[PDB]
Design a protein around this motif. Structure first.
Motif, PDB file in Angstrom:
ATOM      1  N   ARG A 140       0.834  -1.203   0.000  1.00 37.26           N
ATOM      2  CA  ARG A 140       0.000   0.000   0.000  1.00 37.26           C
ATOM      3  C   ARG A 140       0.870   1.255   0.000  1.00 37.26           C
ATOM      4  O   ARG A 140       1.822   1.273   0.702  1.00 37.26           O
ATOM      5  CB  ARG A 140      -1.037  -0.048   1.177  1.00 37.26           C
ATOM      6  CG  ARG A 140      -1.920   1.279   1.253  1.00 37.26           C
ATOM      7  CD  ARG A 140      -3.223   1.084   2.163  1.00 37.26           C
ATOM      8  NE  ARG A 140      -3.897   2.328   2.377  1.00 37.26           N
ATOM      9  CZ  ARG A 140      -5.073   2.765   1.966  1.00 37.26           C
ATOM     10  NH1 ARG A 140      -5.748   2.138   0.982  1.00 37.26           N
ATOM     11  NH2 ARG A 140      -5.529   3.880   2.611  1.00 37.26           N
TER      12      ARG A 140
ATOM     13  N   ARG B 289      -0.104   9.782  -6.566  1.00 37.51           N
ATOM     14  CA  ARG B 289      -0.857  10.343  -7.693  1.00 37.51           C
ATOM     15  C   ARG B 289      -0.464   9.914  -9.066  1.00 37.51           C
ATOM     16  O   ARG B 289      -1.251  10.130 -10.017  1.00 37.51           O
ATOM     17  CB  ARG B 289      -0.762  11.913  -7.606  1.00 37.51           C
ATOM     18  CG  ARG B 289      -1.699  12.619  -6.603  1.00 37.51           C
ATOM     19  CD  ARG B 289      -3.161  12.428  -6.887  1.00 37.51           C
ATOM     20  NE  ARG B 289      -3.991  13.285  -5.956  1.00 37.51           N
ATOM     21  CZ  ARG B 289      -4.873  12.805  -5.036  1.00 37.51           C
ATOM     22  NH1 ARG B 289      -5.030  11.485  -4.844  1.00 37.51           N
ATOM     23  NH2 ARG B 289      -5.582  13.523  -4.201  1.00 37.51           N
TER      24      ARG B 289
ATOM     25  N   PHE C 178      -8.960  16.152 -12.619  1.00 37.10           N
ATOM     26  CA  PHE C 178      -8.102  14.887 -12.664  1.00 37.10           C
ATOM     27  C   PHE C 178      -7.034  14.930 -11.558  1.00 37.10           C
ATOM     28  O   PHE C 178      -6.611  13.880 -11.121  1.00 37.10           O
ATOM     29  CB  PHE C 178      -7.559  14.701 -14.044  1.00 37.10           C
ATOM     30  CG  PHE C 178      -6.379  13.753 -14.223  1.00 37.10           C
ATOM     31  CD1 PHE C 178      -6.603  12.379 -14.184  1.00 37.10           C
ATOM     32  CD2 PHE C 178      -5.016  14.286 -14.379  1.00 37.10           C
ATOM     33  CE1 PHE C 178      -5.522  11.518 -14.387  1.00 37.10           C
ATOM     34  CE2 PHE C 178      -3.950  13.374 -14.513  1.00 37.10           C
ATOM     35  CZ  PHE C 178      -4.221  11.990 -14.525  1.00 37.10           C
ATOM     36  N   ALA C 179      -6.530  16.147 -11.176  1.00 38.11           N
ATOM     37  CA  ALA C 179      -5.386  16.350 -10.248  1.00 38.11           C
ATOM     38  C   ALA C 179      -5.582  15.604  -8.916  1.00 38.11           C
ATOM     39  O   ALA C 179      -4.652  14.937  -8.398  1.00 38.11           O
ATOM     40  CB  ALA C 179      -5.072  17.856  -9.996  1.00 38.11           C
ATOM     41  N   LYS C 180      -6.800  15.813  -8.301  1.00 36.98           N
ATOM     42  CA  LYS C 180      -7.258  15.253  -6.996  1.00 36.98           C
ATOM     43  C   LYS C 180      -7.681  13.785  -7.102  1.00 36.98           C
ATOM     44  O   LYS C 180      -8.143  13.239  -6.077  1.00 36.98           O
ATOM     45  CB  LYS C 180      -8.372  16.148  -6.415  1.00 36.98           C
ATOM     46  CG  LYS C 180      -9.724  16.120  -7.135  1.00 36.98           C
ATOM     47  CD  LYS C 180     -10.520  17.437  -6.926  1.00 36.98           C
ATOM     48  CE  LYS C 180     -11.882  17.497  -7.578  1.00 36.98           C
ATOM     49  NZ  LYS C 180     -12.636  18.746  -7.576  1.00 36.98           N
ATOM     50  N   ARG C 181      -7.657  13.231  -8.365  1.00 30.38           N
ATOM     51  CA  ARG C 181      -8.164  11.954  -8.738  1.00 30.38           C
ATOM     52  C   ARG C 181      -7.351  11.213  -9.868  1.00 30.38           C
ATOM     53  O   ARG C 181      -7.818  10.798 -10.949  1.00 30.38           O
ATOM     54  CB  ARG C 181      -9.624  12.142  -9.227  1.00 30.38           C
ATOM     55  CG  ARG C 181     -10.518  12.958  -8.360  1.00 30.38           C
ATOM     56  CD  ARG C 181     -11.993  12.744  -8.722  1.00 30.38           C
ATOM     57  NE  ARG C 181     -12.886  13.677  -7.985  1.00 30.38           N
ATOM     58  CZ  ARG C 181     -13.181  13.713  -6.669  1.00 30.38           C
ATOM     59  NH1 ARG C 181     -12.616  12.958  -5.769  1.00 30.38           N
ATOM     60  NH2 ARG C 181     -14.096  14.587  -6.261  1.00 30.38           N
ATOM     61  N   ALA C 182      -6.052  11.143  -9.648  1.00 31.93           N
ATOM     62  CA  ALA C 182      -5.017  10.600 -10.488  1.00 31.93           C
ATOM     63  C   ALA C 182      -4.776   9.173 -10.192  1.00 31.93           C
ATOM     64  O   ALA C 182      -5.021   8.320 -11.021  1.00 31.93           O
ATOM     65  CB  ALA C 182      -3.701  11.469 -10.439  1.00 31.93           C
ATOM     66  N   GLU C 183      -4.224   8.891  -9.035  1.00 26.81           N
ATOM     67  CA  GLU C 183      -4.039   7.502  -8.494  1.00 26.81           C
ATOM     68  C   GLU C 183      -5.249   7.091  -7.616  1.00 26.81           C
ATOM     69  O   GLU C 183      -5.270   6.014  -7.032  1.00 26.81           O
ATOM     70  CB  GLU C 183      -2.692   7.338  -7.757  1.00 26.81           C
ATOM     71  CG  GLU C 183      -2.147   5.935  -7.488  1.00 26.81           C
ATOM     72  CD  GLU C 183      -0.690   6.018  -7.122  1.00 26.81           C
ATOM     73  OE1 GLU C 183       0.117   5.525  -7.912  1.00 26.81           O
ATOM     74  OE2 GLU C 183      -0.368   6.497  -6.032  1.00 26.81           O
TER      75      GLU C 183
ATOM     76  N   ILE D 250      -6.123   3.704  -5.443  1.00 28.67           N
ATOM     77  CA  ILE D 250      -6.050   3.819  -3.994  1.00 28.67           C
ATOM     78  C   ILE D 250      -7.317   3.178  -3.404  1.00 28.67           C
ATOM     79  O   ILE D 250      -7.169   2.583  -2.339  1.00 28.67           O
ATOM     80  CB  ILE D 250      -5.919   5.259  -3.620  1.00 28.67           C
ATOM     81  CG1 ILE D 250      -4.480   5.664  -3.896  1.00 28.67           C
ATOM     82  CG2 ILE D 250      -6.253   5.659  -2.230  1.00 28.67           C
ATOM     83  CD1 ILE D 250      -4.279   7.148  -4.104  1.00 28.67           C
TER      84      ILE D 250
ATOM     85  N   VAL E  99      -4.753  -2.029  -6.441  1.00 31.23           N
ATOM     86  CA  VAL E  99      -3.891  -2.811  -5.579  1.00 31.23           C
ATOM     87  C   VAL E  99      -3.428  -2.081  -4.317  1.00 31.23           C
ATOM     88  O   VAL E  99      -3.157  -2.810  -3.364  1.00 31.23           O
ATOM     89  CB  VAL E  99      -2.715  -3.423  -6.385  1.00 31.23           C
ATOM     90  CG1 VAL E  99      -3.338  -4.438  -7.367  1.00 31.23           C
ATOM     91  CG2 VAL E  99      -1.934  -2.320  -7.045  1.00 31.23           C
ATOM     92  N   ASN E 100      -3.521  -0.799  -4.373  1.00 27.55           N
ATOM     93  CA  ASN E 100      -3.183   0.100  -3.250  1.00 27.55           C
ATOM     94  C   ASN E 100      -4.212   0.058  -2.108  1.00 27.55           C
ATOM     95  O   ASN E 100      -3.928   0.334  -0.942  1.00 27.55           O
ATOM     96  CB  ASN E 100      -2.931   1.594  -3.650  1.00 27.55           C
ATOM     97  CG  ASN E 100      -1.845   1.790  -4.669  1.00 27.55           C
ATOM     98  OD1 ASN E 100      -2.190   2.009  -5.909  1.00 27.55           O
ATOM     99  ND2 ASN E 100      -0.607   1.660  -4.189  1.00 27.55           N
TER     100      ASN E 100
ATOM    101  N   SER F 260      -5.181  -2.355  -0.589  1.00 29.91           N
ATOM    102  CA  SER F 260      -4.796  -3.598   0.076  1.00 29.91           C
ATOM    103  C   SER F 260      -5.469  -3.719   1.496  1.00 29.91           C
ATOM    104  O   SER F 260      -5.021  -3.064   2.445  1.00 29.91           O
ATOM    105  CB  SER F 260      -3.267  -3.603   0.330  1.00 29.91           C
ATOM    106  OG  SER F 260      -2.738  -4.693   1.037  1.00 29.91           O
TER     107      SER F 260
ATOM    108  N   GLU G 233      -7.836  -2.113   2.661  1.00 35.51           N
ATOM    109  CA  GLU G 233      -8.477  -0.825   3.007  1.00 35.51           C
ATOM    110  C   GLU G 233      -9.288  -0.468   1.707  1.00 35.51           C
ATOM    111  O   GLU G 233      -8.827  -0.647   0.601  1.00 35.51           O
ATOM    112  CB  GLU G 233      -7.439   0.272   3.308  1.00 35.51           C
ATOM    113  CG  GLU G 233      -6.851  -0.046   4.661  1.00 35.51           C
ATOM    114  CD  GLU G 233      -5.892   1.018   5.270  1.00 35.51           C
ATOM    115  OE1 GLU G 233      -6.425   2.150   5.510  1.00 35.51           O
ATOM    116  OE2 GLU G 233      -4.689   0.698   5.233  1.00 35.51           O
ATOM    117  N   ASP G 234     -10.424   0.251   1.907  1.00 35.21           N
ATOM    118  CA  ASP G 234     -11.326   0.572   0.815  1.00 35.21           C
ATOM    119  C   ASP G 234     -11.797  -0.727   0.083  1.00 35.21           C
ATOM    120  O   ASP G 234     -11.974  -1.762   0.691  1.00 35.21           O
ATOM    121  CB  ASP G 234     -10.701   1.685  -0.094  1.00 35.21           C
ATOM    122  CG  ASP G 234     -10.087   2.816   0.632  1.00 35.21           C
ATOM    123  OD1 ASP G 234      -8.817   2.859   0.805  1.00 35.21           O
ATOM    124  OD2 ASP G 234     -10.887   3.657   1.052  1.00 35.21           O
ATOM    125  N   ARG G 235     -12.023  -0.697  -1.216  1.00 34.93           N
ATOM    126  CA  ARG G 235     -12.748  -1.705  -1.899  1.00 34.93           C
ATOM    127  C   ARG G 235     -14.233  -1.794  -1.571  1.00 34.93           C
ATOM    128  O   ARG G 235     -14.879  -2.734  -2.073  1.00 34.93           O
ATOM    129  CB  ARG G 235     -12.096  -3.111  -1.955  1.00 34.93           C
ATOM    130  CG  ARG G 235     -10.836  -3.137  -2.786  1.00 34.93           C
ATOM    131  CD  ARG G 235     -10.047  -4.480  -2.579  1.00 34.93           C
ATOM    132  NE  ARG G 235      -8.633  -4.402  -3.035  1.00 34.93           N
ATOM    133  CZ  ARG G 235      -7.754  -5.417  -2.995  1.00 34.93           C
ATOM    134  NH1 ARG G 235      -8.084  -6.689  -2.715  1.00 34.93           N
ATOM    135  NH2 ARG G 235      -6.511  -5.103  -3.407  1.00 34.93           N
TER     136      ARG G 235
END
Lengths: 70, 100
Positions: A59, A63, B20-25, B29, B33-34, B36, B38-40
């Motif tokens: 984790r 960005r 897009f700036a605030k919502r890139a990765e 997340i 896979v990030n 992990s 958490e979330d999903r």
């Protein structure tokens, strides 16, 4: 019974009581309306909404994608 | 040729910055896979609905000085026709004709 050919008595004359509901049977589904197919869903025979096994990683929270320096 | 695709691209760079700036990765997340353990989950999977036009995947550019239907060239900010045109007049630097 006939004069030129008789009934036999070799295996076909034994056990005058069985059933499916009088007695146990290892198979079901002999009505025309209970029968299997082994359908497995197309494109989800295995898994495709998948948990990663070619891009799993530890984790973080940034960005971008391998930005490194910039 | 044709201004509407050139008009689309000019609006897009301020709209890249805004959505897009605030919502890139954030896709990665919250879903991938990030995320992990958490979330999903549904209560966080509604957050990215503004960016769709803002995405780098629609940032095609074309000819940065006129517009052109495909055949853009990224190193000049120019195209096939417009490069040759600028070279005739010597406006492009360092420019050889190939011979070796």
């Amino acid at each position: 019974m006939k004069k030129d050919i008789h009934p036999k008595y070799e295996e076909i004359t034994a056990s005058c009581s069985c059933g499916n509901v009088m007695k146990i049977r290892s198979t079901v589904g002999h009505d025309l309306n209970l029968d299997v197919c082994s359908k497995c869903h197309p494109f989800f025979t295995g898994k495709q909404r998948d948990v990663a096994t070619g891009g799993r990683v530890d984790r973080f929270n940034k960005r971008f994608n391998i930005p490194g320096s910039k | 040729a044709k201004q509407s695709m050139k008009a689309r691209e000019v609006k897009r760079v301020a709209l890249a910055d805004k959505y897009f700036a605030k919502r890139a990765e954030l896709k990665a997340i919250i879903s991938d896979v990030n995320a992990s353990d958490e979330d999903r989950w549904n209560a966080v999977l509604k957050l990215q609905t503004l960016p769709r036009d803002s995405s780098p995947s629609r940032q095609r550019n074309r000819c940065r000085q006129t517009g052109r239907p495909h055949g853009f060239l990224r190193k000049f900010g120019l195209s096939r026709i417009k490069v040759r045109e600028a070279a005739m007049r010597g406006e492009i630097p360092g420019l050889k004709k190939a011979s070796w």
